[PDB]
Structure 1
Amino acid sequence: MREIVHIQAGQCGNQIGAKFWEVISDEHGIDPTGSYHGDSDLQLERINVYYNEATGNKYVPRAILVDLEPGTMDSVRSGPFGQIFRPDNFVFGQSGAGNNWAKGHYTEGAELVDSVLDVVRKESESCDCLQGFQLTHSLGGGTGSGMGTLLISKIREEYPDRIMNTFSVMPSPKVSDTVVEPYNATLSVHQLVENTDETYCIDNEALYDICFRTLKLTTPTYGDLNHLVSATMSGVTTCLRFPGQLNADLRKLAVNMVPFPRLHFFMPGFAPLTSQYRALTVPELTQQMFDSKNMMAACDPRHGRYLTVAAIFRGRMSMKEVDEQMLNVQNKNSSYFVEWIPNNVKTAVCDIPPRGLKMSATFIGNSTAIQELFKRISEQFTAMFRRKAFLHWYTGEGMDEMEFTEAESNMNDLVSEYQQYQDA
């Protein structure tokens, strides 16, 4: 188990996805045309996880770029690292999906899905040992939401034993393109509860607040939100992309993070938050990454309890001080970690720091406080659905009101299930 297949779907999926390849290619010393110009052998030791090797010693990302319109995928190709991607892996339709889950999942996206799966099969075939898939998308649009979850369902049919993880951007009125986002997200969440092993719940509410409150940016663009996303995505993928004596693949990580199959929605976090000169001390990283302000999903961890925690520190620091600090927050806030999973906070350290920072920490939290996120989308859903508002857009594409009722019920069951373990 070494190779991971990456897929990016829709405007948002391709935007944050393109930043992921901008960040990690710099970390692996791969230039905009695909040639290696690093210095450490550690940059090439596990380069196979995300790159295929081409003729002339070129490194081509194992990345499939999906959208139902050309727009954003034309921007990706024109953008700074656009030339590195394999041209066959740009699979796109023309009419778009108009922020419509039904168009992505059932009509427009159905017409395109089989040609995307052919490229996935192409990449999966020439993989010595495929460990799984990762997907970037939003749940608020049409393509990433509707087609992304369709692809996830088709990939599970063809590759039932491989890991499926997602980086799933959640919608919020604060950063809102259309009023139907709660509908699109609720329909997607039900798909993710069934068909993913992990979903990283990037909340655009939280990314905005981090940009506004704790980074003093008055008018945040999507680039400012995506900067925080790409830093986190680098962090969660670090332990696969480098050593250091950590013998773990996606399954091993998923086995230790997910005690219950449906409860695999994580709370990502990063320290320090950037947009510096004084490098942070190990106590500061530990306090910041556990701080609510640094959470990428707009939930208060004090309102829930941690099932599992994973923290991966980057940079040259004392592992003794890391162990001391990670044991300090557990033993001084022991009510917020479930007693019925002993030793649930685990830690790794990687020597290579990311670009610009001398040391950093990435936080992955399977907290029951994530119910707050699903409750917030459930309220926005019901507000519209009690009056069947905007439903004509979905019923015109052949959907039934029953499918909405089901999805509503399934997400409120997920919230009930998170509540069960919060009190136990």
Structure 2
Amino acid sequence: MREIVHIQAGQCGNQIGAKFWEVISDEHGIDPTGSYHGDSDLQLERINVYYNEATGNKYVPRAILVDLEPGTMDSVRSGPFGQIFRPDNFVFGQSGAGNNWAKGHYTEGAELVDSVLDVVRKESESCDCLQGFQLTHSLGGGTGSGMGTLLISKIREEYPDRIMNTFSVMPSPKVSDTVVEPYNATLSVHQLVENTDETYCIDNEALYDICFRTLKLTTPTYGDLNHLVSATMSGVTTCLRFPGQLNADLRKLAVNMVPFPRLHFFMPGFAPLTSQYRALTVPELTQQMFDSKNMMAACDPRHGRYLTVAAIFRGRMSMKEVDEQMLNVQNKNSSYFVEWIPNNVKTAVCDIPPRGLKMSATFIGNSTAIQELFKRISEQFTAMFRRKAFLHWYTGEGMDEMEFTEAESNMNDLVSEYQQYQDA
């Protein structure tokens, strides 16, 4: 029994976090009341990874809900599966973070962080053998970005030998709330490079384009965007939630996916893209899961090379055909896979498909093309920082310009490091 402690911070973090728990509770057969009503023991064999057991056989999500304002968490509690969460695990303030990394990380978040760590400690003490943490948050706001990375640092201090994993939503001018999002993102990336083991880069730019171009949604809402995220989060955590051989835990996944400590930012993918009654063939699942249009990071994988790849197929299908198709795409595009990491593509197959689908495939790639994401943020950062625009919001919270310079330099370092292994 290797438990994971889930944490969701800020507006975005709690919105996608709530939908994540809605999806996987349905997959594990848990109702909004915490009662199990499934018809398969595969649903319960590893349910302790994300759920605690209560008397009366109630299953409670090992989840901690954090925000600097009560708004979104009030909506979550009033939501569909709002009752399933432990009331004590709702930690919130009143001030808000005003889309300001400094407020989340240094001032407002500093006042609340200890009460969150108290809940984290209480959950960890109940774990038979805690394997690590997963955090859901955005990098463009204040609470998820600033207080989220503050939490990560504090958690690493108390649990230095545990795996830290994040689902991090990257900001985009296409789907933007504030002009200071590149500032918050750059400051956050600096933290993630040092203090996480695995980070799934979820690009709001990619999510919008998928809703627009593919799902034919004329006016995508955040709800439409979060549908893609929750589906992606379900697929990527499948190997953790169900009996399997490959990447069955956070540490084994990190060992397979991270050849160099700083290069741990993953480009997720999903197929089929759903917003349909005919099922996809195994060849079709394979072609689409590797297609750029099914990627969630808005980076062209043909503009780089794959260091490591994890693939997860769900549903009843021929594992022989899965092996053949996975070998096919590798042998057909071998140039896009680094040759100094032999057999760097790993495939897992789970028998239980996601809701509404008979077959699905989830893609996890460590590609050097992810540098395009950081380059994008870096340009938007510099465009403002060269004129010190909107800096007063941060210096007013006690920050100095030097901290911005350091964050910028370290992200540019990360970019050049990817380029280094792309040419190697």
TM-score category by the smaller chain? over 0.9
In the TM superposition, residue 2 of structure 1 has moved relative to its aligned partner by 1.1
1:349-390 deviation digits (Å, cap 9, x = unpaired): 000000000000000000000000000000000000000000
Question: Residue 96 of structure 2 corresponds to which residue in structure 1?
Answer: 96
Consecutive aligned runs of 4 or more in structure 1 exceeding 4 Å deviation: none
Separation (CA, whole Å) in 2 of partners of 1:357 and 1:156 = 38
1:8-48 deviation digits (Å, cap 9, x = unpaired): 00000000000000000000111011111111111111110
Matched, 1:348 2:358: no
Q: TM-score of the superposition, structure 2-length normalised?
A: 0.99
In the TM superposition, residue 248 of structure 1 has moved relative to its aligned partner by 2.7
In the TM superposition, residue 249 of structure 1 has moved relative to its aligned partner by 1.4
The 3-state SS of whatever aligns with 2:131 is strand
RMSD, aligned α-carbons = 0.7
Question: Residue 9 of structure 2 corresponds to which residue in structure 1?
Answer: 9
Question: Residue 262 of structure 2 corresponds to which residue in structure 1?
Answer: 262
Separation (CA, whole Å) in 1 of partners of 2:240 and 2:139 = 26
Whether the 8 Å CA contact 2:267–2:295 is kept in 1: the answer is yes
The 3-state SS of whatever aligns with 1:280 is coil
1:282-311 deviation digits (Å, cap 9, x = unpaired): 011100000000000000000000000000
In the TM superposition, residue 186 of structure 1 has moved relative to its aligned partner by 0.0
In the TM superposition, residue 247 of structure 1 has moved relative to its aligned partner by 7.1
Whether the 8 Å CA contact 2:194–2:262 is kept in 1: the answer is yes
In the TM superposition, residue 246 of structure 1 has moved relative to its aligned partner by 4.5
Separation (CA, whole Å) in 2 of partners of 1:397 and 1:94 = 18
1:87-119 deviation digits (Å, cap 9, x = unpaired): 000000001000000000000000000000000
The 3-state SS of whatever aligns with 1:140 is coil
The 3-state SS of whatever aligns with 1:364 is strand
In the TM superposition, residue 69 of structure 1 has moved relative to its aligned partner by 0.2
In the TM superposition, residue 182 of structure 1 has moved relative to its aligned partner by 0.1
Separation (CA, whole Å) in 2 of partners of 1:39 and 1:285 = 27
In the TM superposition, residue 279 of structure 1 has moved relative to its aligned partner by 0.2
More displaced stretch, 167-176 vs 38-47 = 38-47
Whether the 8 Å CA contact 2:268–2:363 is kept in 1: the answer is yes
1:34-89 deviation digits (Å, cap 9, x = unpaired): 11111111111111000000121100000000000000000000000000000000
Separation (CA, whole Å) in 2 of partners of 1:245 and 1:186 = 36
Q: TM-score of the superposition, structure 1-length normalised?
A: 0.99
Separation (CA, whole Å) in 2 of partners of 1:33 and 1:328 = 45
Whether the 8 Å CA contact 2:166–2:198 is kept in 1: the answer is yes
In the TM superposition, residue 244 of structure 1 has moved relative to its aligned partner by 3.4
In the TM superposition, residue 217 of structure 1 has moved relative to its aligned partner by 0.4
More displaced stretch, 248-257 vs 385-394 = 248-257
For structure 2, the residue ranges without an aligned partner over 5 or more in a row are none
Whether the 8 Å CA contact 2:246–2:347 is kept in 1: the answer is no
Separation (CA, whole Å) in 2 of partners of 1:378 and 1:2 = 38
Separation (CA, whole Å) in 2 of partners of 1:290 and 1:121 = 40
Separation (CA, whole Å) in 2 of partners of 1:246 and 1:198 = 16
1:184-207 deviation digits (Å, cap 9, x = unpaired): 000000000000000000000000
Question: Residue 383 of structure 2 corresponds to which residue in structure 1?
Answer: 383
Pick closer, same or farther for the CA change 1:373–1:245 going to 2, 3 Å: closer
Separation (CA, whole Å) in 2 of partners of 1:266 and 1:18 = 22
Pick closer, same or farther for the CA change 1:357–1:88 going to 2, 3 Å: same
The 3-state SS of whatever aligns with 1:48 is helix
For structure 1, the residue ranges without an aligned partner over 5 or more in a row are none
The 3-state SS of whatever aligns with 1:60 is strand
Separation (CA, whole Å) in 1 of partners of 2:83 and 2:143 = 23
The 3-state SS of whatever aligns with 1:20 is helix
Question: Residue 271 of structure 2 corresponds to which residue in structure 1?
Answer: 271
Question: Residue 129 of structure 2 corresponds to which residue in structure 1?
Answer: 129
In the TM superposition, residue 276 of structure 1 has moved relative to its aligned partner by 1.9
The 3-state SS of whatever aligns with 1:6 is strand
Separation (CA, whole Å) in 1 of partners of 2:140 and 2:362 = 25
The 3-state SS of whatever aligns with 2:56 is coil
The 3-state SS of whatever aligns with 1:193 is helix
1:131-161 deviation digits (Å, cap 9, x = unpaired): 1000000000000000000000000000000
Whether the 8 Å CA contact 2:245–2:348 is kept in 1: the answer is no
Question: Residue 236 of structure 1 corresponds to which residue in structure 2?
Answer: 236
The 3-state SS of whatever aligns with 2:96 is coil
In the TM superposition, residue 273 of structure 1 has moved relative to its aligned partner by 0.3
Whether the 8 Å CA contact 2:240–2:247 is kept in 1: the answer is no
In the TM superposition, residue 332 of structure 1 has moved relative to its aligned partner by 0.7
